[PDB]
Symmetry: D2
Subunit: 359 residues, 4 copies
């Protein structure tokens, strides 16, 4: 069987025929892969930056069901939930390894579990999300979107501690969000916050790309060029109710944006920072205390969030047709090894989502 | 100005030109009506089945176009007014939530205290206006009915947070089953939104499915039960439900029939406004409700956040359920086609989901 | 071993020595009974009003002393067993919460599947044991009944989070009024806990107050209503309630009487297990429930966190309401005083709150 | 009228007769003060560290109602809520200026509002908490305890984001709390967490005082001497589900205790740090992200929390009689000016609560 394989914690990837008999199987439903998606976590594994001799790569997949089994029909498109329970703690037991208390959960194509960049795989109905044909084109995005659905869901649940966090009209329309970092995570955060009616500011250290500009216009989102800092934003707009870190960046970005957090506000840590150290002085922290501010680490969506992601992706073909068309950067054939290896090892400038097609 | 008007104790409806000076104005934004919708409350008022003013403008379902760029609203934007507005006194109303008004002294447009929206144009306050994207103009009139249901289901899920774990093995609610009694617009919209949330649905009506219901069945993967001879056969083959919605305008004895089909920790959602009957509640039924943590909840009125959720869900349905979505508007009537207009105002058509009025 | 035993379809109760080998053991901790409490469920079983085993040990209310230092439990500690234990299958039971058991296949000690606690000693699992401080030994038997009520009120407040603002101008619930129908231990404990939370309370019984009720009235600042002639006079003078608790074991027609006294957004808490009657629910009553967001909720069973809250609240009452607290134990009977013991098991005394059994 | 007055932002305090006619009045109920309490905020104002020529000091008070008015009877003991709404935002409007969005709320004896160290004052029923005579002796503590009730209430509400944060028995008994800093805030946090059934560790850079030792024994609380750091605690006990900063300290304490925070855990910032700067490296922050950790600033209890505080103080006379007796360090006469001025300007070693008696 053709698979895309890695041999961790060593760097490198191959695109090759492997023994289907040594690959991990997860239940009785056979699924023939049609698309994979590639993200930074995939790049990391390829560049060694993170029984079996190899691991199958990939945690973003849509496949087709080959024969009807119980809930699922032949020809149904499905997406597997990539994070799976440790089998021990109460969070995993209730289907919620995003809150696993042992850290011993499985991750498809990362840890303890062959991924899904392979011709086909066997999975269990309980881990499969139905992907309506009507969103087949952008449906691969339900996986990453799922983390963000979980994040926004959580940030809203936490904000229930504030007696009234709604506006005069009963909505969250008057709440402002600063999303730092564009890239597929910042873009998805923006789209989903806009869907919920909040006002959003996107910030990058540069002017917008064409995708971002289309996002601005179509969703009525604001953009702030943050190359010389945040002072002008705070002077022009004042403070934000929610701030999302969506950069894989130097934690010092947190020093820059923390002073833009408003009363009762939330700083959502979602990006996985790779460099730096950020000083917090006593005046900063005492202010956090005085104004009921919260900082929260945001991670991993589970099945309910994949299903939310599907409904939202569906709404975005209606509401935001032009942005939705720009979500998929390009599709690369599983058969074009040179171009595949290239996209696998490296992100192109301003990439949203690279897709793998198995044909 | 052209207006559809009623003279509220009395039966009667007229489509005539009326003195604009006399019509309630609610703010600074001028909006030219393009669509109204009609519901059973309109019919009821039209047949007299329900203050210095001679007449009342009918109608609480409206889309209009913003005449002149105002603050946040562009010349040309479609908007929908929130029909229930606060009593100005209680804490729920002051936070934008008269659906939970504590005085009961709230305003209802086209119904009580408030001229409605079946008139050429009106003035409003932005805080009462929901933006309707052009990409959902065709079925967007449905955001007003759907708002009540978004609120009812949001509430049902908030209430069920009393159960330590009401989610399923996979972390979802896909294993929860909803029985929806009553088809037609409320029943149909409950089904679609519960399916959208991923729950299993049975619609039930004392008859075989209409064309629209059959379409939803097939497109949404929904189950149907002919309840003409009661519920014994549904109980025996499917068992009990986690949620039951009364969406019938029916006789309250309906509850005596569906209550035995309520499962452990389940919710009976009373949404329909019953207009006849008395239902006996035996001590064994009642002490079973006690032993099994059952809840009966009266469900009423969506507000602005729910209109906005309705908008997002109508938009998802155009993609996800394209055949059912395009069948939610039964037909459009011109304001200038008087004979037909008068007929749709007076009575409902068999299998009608929504009749829309277009202003030309 | 000395044990109070019953032979569950049948009426009859005996206090005799029984084969220890035959009694259900639940874990590794040995506990010597010092107190039992008696409630109406015991009486019911004793009068036959409700598996390789000949007899069942009665009683679900117990304090014992830890015989031998175990893990977390010191030789000499008082403990109380949680009486309802999970079915081992469903998600609610697996998180320690069989009060919301989805199979209904839970165990109940001294009642069904499970030998009770009216026996000299038993073995248990620490996860089922609540620590009873010595400073509340006198009234600590009450933590078992109070646990059901802590759970019912916790639930009522969780449910009322559906209302955007259910707090008062001062940010509290002091302006919310509770009607408690039924006095005696459940009604009395509901009153005390709702007062503890700061809400206004009216107790109601079809008679003038007993000595104990009068004491609570005065000490807790609670209101009383003689309901002998219905509720019209309470409605006319006080108006409507935000919460009404049925704590009567009564006839379900009681609900037909108190339902008109439920206010907007209010909750009818069904806690009492009614054993006769059929109550008619008219369409106007039902559509009013709809328009005003009313909720009817079946209230059942406290679990461990609620026993522990009960413990904290019993302790607060010794300070805050010292006269009422010392009247919650009506009297203590010796296990060795058989004639009297048999009488308290068979029937309740007028105005009894709690009869305690002491093991000597 | 005798009052204890300050002339902000200048340092200094006087104990003297003032013109009752220039003092702030808040409603129609007249209250003759009996006790005040003194805390660090009072010390700060006295040492200038933070129409009218002076402000009456003090936000901790119990008084007696002089005549029956509406709800309140002659002889009823009452405590005023010290923080009061800005009159503009929705949080204040619902009685919750702990979440005020303008920052323009009033604070008795600090800001915009004469305090309560004065012979008597006029207040509004809506701001008054009933103090049962049965807890008159320790009842002054309801004010500070109120902030902590609000804090624990909030930390628990936030933890509802975790699908199951309860233990196998349905309780929070298996959850561990680290309370850093003893002193009245750390002590009250400890007592209240123990009341809720959680296991608690108190930490100071020294061995326990007599009060603390009585707290340990009577509540079955643990103590860790943290003078040489937290490594031995983490080695012996492992990680904590909740960590409370109750020190007025150098923010660097946060660097020391953050690595003791466990999965899904909460760091509650309650103390107002006065010195220092704390570096957060990328490995620390990325870990926060991976494990759904939250940091939250904790501030101010309102009327419902004062009423909770009363019920708990009442339970603690039953449950923890010896600790409860040690809560009041000493009572000082309003008439002993030298000793009053002394306690007003400075905290004595290991002080829990100094009381002022008006006789
Ligand atoms: N927590 C979770 O569950 C979860 C799940 C998935 C991913 N993630 C993490 O989310 C982060 C974002 O992922 P992604 O795939 O969108 O990353 P990406 O493709 O690397 O995009 C990151 C964005 O940040 C921008 N950026 C870099 N430095 C910045 C700065 N100082 N200020 C403002 N913007 C800056 C970049 O600009 P350019 O467009 O010019 O390159 C880029 O658009 C990554 O660390 C990833 O690992 C977390
Ligand atoms: N709570 C709120 O805030 C709110 C808001 C809006 C509307 N409502 C109420 O909701 C109810 C339904 O509204 P609607 O517009 O959908 O009314 P509708 O158009 O009359 O539809 C009612 C449906 O109930 C079916 N039905 C009647 N009796 C039944 C029975 N015994 N068993 C099963 N099905 C039965 C009807 O059958 P056929 O199709 O064969 O005629 C019809 O399909 C009304 O009472 C309305 O006043 C409440
Ligand atoms: N849901 C649960 O988890 C749970 C747990 C425990 C108990 N319960 C149930 O709760 C109920 C009460 O328990 P209990 O121990 O307090 O019973 P109880 O000792 O019999 O007390 C019942 C009270 O109701 C009063 N009462 C009876 N009919 C009344 C009426 N029509 N109007 C007003 N008051 C009336 C009685 O009057 P007098 O004092 O003059 O006789 C008595 O004061 C029982 O049904 C019991 O089975 C439920
Ligand atoms: N957020 C709010 O709403 C609110 C309300 C009231 C008070 N506060 C703040 O809470 C903080 C605590 O107040 P308090 O009155 O209890 O303060 P306190 O009397 O100054 O006690 C502080 C405690 O921290 C200990 N400590 C100092 N440095 C430490 C370190 N590095 N590690 C461990 N412990 C250390 C001290 O030990 P010793 O006993 O030897 O002196 C003392 O017991 C203050 O900053 C106060 O302003 C906040
Ligand atoms: Zn990915
Ligand atoms: Zn796990
Ligand atoms: Zn309508
Ligand atoms: Zn109102
Ligand atoms: Zn009992
Ligand atoms: Zn169970
Ligand atoms: Zn203070
Ligand atoms: Zn404010």
């Amino acid at each position: 069987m053709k698979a895309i394989i890695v041999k961790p914690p060593n760097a490198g990837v191959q695109v090759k025929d492997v023994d289907e008999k040594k690959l991990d199987s997860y239940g009785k439903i056979k699924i023939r892969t049609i698309y994979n998606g590639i993200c930074g976590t995939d790049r990391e594994i390829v560049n060694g930056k993170l029984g079996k001799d190899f691991l199958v790569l990939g945690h973003e997949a849509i496949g087709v069901v080959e024969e009807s089994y119980h809930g699922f029909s032949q020809g149904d498109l499905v997406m597997p939930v990539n994070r799976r329970g440790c089998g021990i703690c109460r969070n995993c037991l209730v289907g919620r390894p995003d809150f696993c208390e042992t850290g011993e959960f499985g991750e498809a194509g990362i840890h303890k579990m062959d991924g899904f960049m392979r011709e086909w795989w066997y999975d269990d109905p309980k881990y499969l999300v139905k992907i309506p044909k009507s969103i087949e084109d952008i449906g691969i995005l339900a996986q990453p979107l799922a983390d963000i659905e979980k994040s926004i869901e959580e940030i809203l649940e936490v904000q229930k501690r504030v007696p009234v966090w709604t506006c005069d009209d009963g909505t969250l329309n008057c709440r402002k969000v600063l999303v730092v970092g564009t890239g597929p995570i910042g873009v998805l955060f923006t789209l989903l916050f806009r869907t919920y009616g909040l006002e959003v500011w996107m910030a990058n250290r540069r002017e917008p790309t064409e995708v971002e500009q289309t996002v601005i216009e179509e969703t009525k989102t604001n953009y702030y060029n943050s190359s010389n800092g945040y002072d002008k934003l705070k002077d022009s707009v004042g403070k934000f109710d929610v701030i999302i870190d969506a950069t894989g960046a130097d934690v010092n970005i947190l020093g820059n944006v923390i002073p833009l957090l408003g009363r009762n506000g939330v700083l959502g840590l979602f990006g996985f920072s790779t460099s730096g150290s950020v000083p917090l002085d006593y005046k900063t922290l005492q202010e956090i205390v005085h104004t009921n501010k919260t900082i929260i680490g945001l991670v991993n969506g589970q099945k309910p969030h994949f299903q939310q992601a599907v409904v939202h992706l569906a709404s975005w073909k209606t509401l935001y047709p032009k942005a939705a068309k720009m979500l998929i950067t390009k599709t690369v054939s599983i058969n074009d090894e040179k171009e595949l290896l290239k996209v696998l090892r490296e992100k192109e400038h301003g990439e949203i989502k690279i897709r793998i097609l198995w044909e």
